[PDB]
């Protein structure tokens, strides 16, 4: 089931986020950091291990896609590229983002960061580096994700997803 950003209608001032990865505990902690504070708009969090997403007739709009990647394991990579085949190209227009964890510890980074940099640059998608283990870094990434959600969801008048993509674009 290929996911589409333009399937249904969203709720009244409602925003949704999707997190796809392997480490369930890290996803739960990241969602806890997400919902530590709530803005004016209500927020829904979805966590999944792989794509295509399980079928559900009651699925609301998923306005943001975030893939967590650990440089500690190639298994998370293979998961990401296998899951990437179950989403349309329209999500790639600023509705998709990549968050790499553990990049600071160069000794613990199994795969080289050049690989994920090339992967992100190939699809022209934003790339973010953070460490979920550290509480401060996790919190900072928490307001970062909340506010990028606010930008992409259309809550603030003036910009869209393609605008922020042209903002967050890398030179090469």
């Amino acid at each position: 089931s290929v996911l589409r950003p333009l399937d249904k209608l969203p709720g009244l001032n409602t925003a949704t986020i999707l997190l796809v990865g392997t480490e369930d505990a890290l996803l739960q902690q990241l969602a806890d950091s997400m919902l530590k504070e709530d803005c004016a708009s209500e927020l829904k969090v979805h966590l999944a291990k792989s794509l295509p997403l399980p079928s559900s007739v009651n699925r609301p709009r998923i306005d943001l896609i975030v893939f967590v990647v650990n440089l500690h394991s190639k298994y998370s990579l293979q998961n990401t590229e296998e899951s990437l085949r179950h989403v349309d190209a329209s999500f790639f227009l600023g509705k998709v983002c990549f968050l790499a964890t553990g990049a600071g510890r160069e000794s613990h980074c199994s795969i080289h960061r050049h690989t994920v940099v090339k992967l992100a640059h190939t699809y022209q998608s934003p790339l973010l580096y953070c460490d979920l283990e550290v509480e401060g870094f996790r919190a900072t990434m928490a307001q970062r994700l909340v506010r990028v959600l606010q930008i992409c969801a259309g809550h603030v008048p003036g910009v869209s997803a393609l605008n922020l993509l042209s903002l967050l674009r890398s030179s090469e």
């Binding site: 500690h72 394991s73 298994y75 199994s110 795969i111 960061r113 050049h114």
Partner: protein
């Protein structure tokens, strides 16, 4: 001067270029200047890795002065003696400086230090004439002696040793590199060690393959003769992972590689190196020599 072009070259150093293919080392006998007894003492021993900034005003002549200075520092810290020796034949090129050994003998050697650089020219290409570039240090002995020697070197030559670390990518590459090497006498089956990431100490998988089976699988996944390529390493790892999952339905790919041992040499992430066969020894150094540069740059 050198600083400006050095800034430019590390500005050009970005994680954008493809990883170049590496030439498989061939069976090479020990060089004539290489003393078999000295390397035999060096080989079949455990070594800890250290990366070093280039020496400032280092002379190979006043070795006795260095020995007595280290002895004075040691007795100041406190039936032992410090011996300096010069070792020939283990430089990658003529550009690479001469290598030397330092030993602690209790008047029975207890602590050994090796300073070397093989095929390391990028550091030598960005250095002035005063400095000596031997960024590779191998330590074998008590940690207290290593700390004391490091303190003396920091005070003397204005440099530090940094504990060099090896990631899973580099360790898998070097594993493929030595499994590409041809060994006449398979005296040690290849063996890999893993560690599941968990705060309490958990299972540590050790996976061993018979040398004949390993060589056959390698030659099956060997495409470019005399060269190793990233696709070869990736398919090697993928075949091992597929075999493991077929056996046990366990994704070994979600585990950290921590130690790789083969017939010729063995490496550990913390910086442990064991060397058995001299025929590829020199080439070994060259590879790990690049890592020192990659830590300096």
């Amino acid at each position: 001067p050198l600083q400006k072009r050095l800034e430019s070259v590390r500005k050009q150093s970005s994680f954008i270029l493809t990883p170049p293919r590496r030439k498989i080392p061939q069976c090479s006998q020990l060089q004539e200047d290489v003393d078999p007894q000295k390397v035999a003492f060096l080989l079949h021993k455990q070594w800890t890795l250290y990366s070093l900034t280039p020496l400032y005003k280092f002379s190979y002549s006043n070795l006795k002065e260095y020995s007595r200075l280290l002895n004075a520092f040691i007795v100041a810290e406190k039936n032992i003696k410090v011996i300096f020796s010069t070792l020939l034949g283990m430089k990658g090129t003529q550009r690479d400086p001469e290598a030397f050994l330092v030993q602690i003998v209790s008047k029975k050697v207890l602590w050994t230090g090796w300073f070397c650089c093989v095929f390391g020219d990028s550091l030598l290409e960005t250095v002035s004439e005063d400095f000596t570039c031997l960024p590779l240090f191998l330590a074998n002995g008590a940690e207290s002696n290593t700390a004391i020697i490091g303190t003396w070197f920091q005070k003397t030559f204005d440099c530090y040793f940094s504990p060099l670390a090896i990631n899973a990518f580099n360790l898998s590459w070097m594993a493929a590199m030595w499994t590409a090497c041809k060994m006449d006498h398979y005296v040690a089956t290849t063996e890999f060690l893993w560690s599941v990431p968990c705060s309490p100490q958990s299972l540590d998988i050790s996976f061993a393959i018979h040398p004949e089976d390993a060589k056959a699988l390698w030659d099956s996944v060997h495409k470019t003769p005399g060269e190793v390529t990233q696709e070869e390493v990736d398919l090697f790892m993928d075949c091992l992972y597929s075999h493991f999952h077929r056996h046990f339905k366990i994704h070994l790919s979600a585990t950290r590689l921590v130690r790789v041992s083969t017939s010729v040499a063995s490496a550990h992430t913390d910086g442990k190196i064991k060397i058995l066969c001299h025929k590829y020894l020199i080439g070994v150094l060259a590879y790990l020599t690049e890592l020192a540069i990659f830590q300096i740059e």
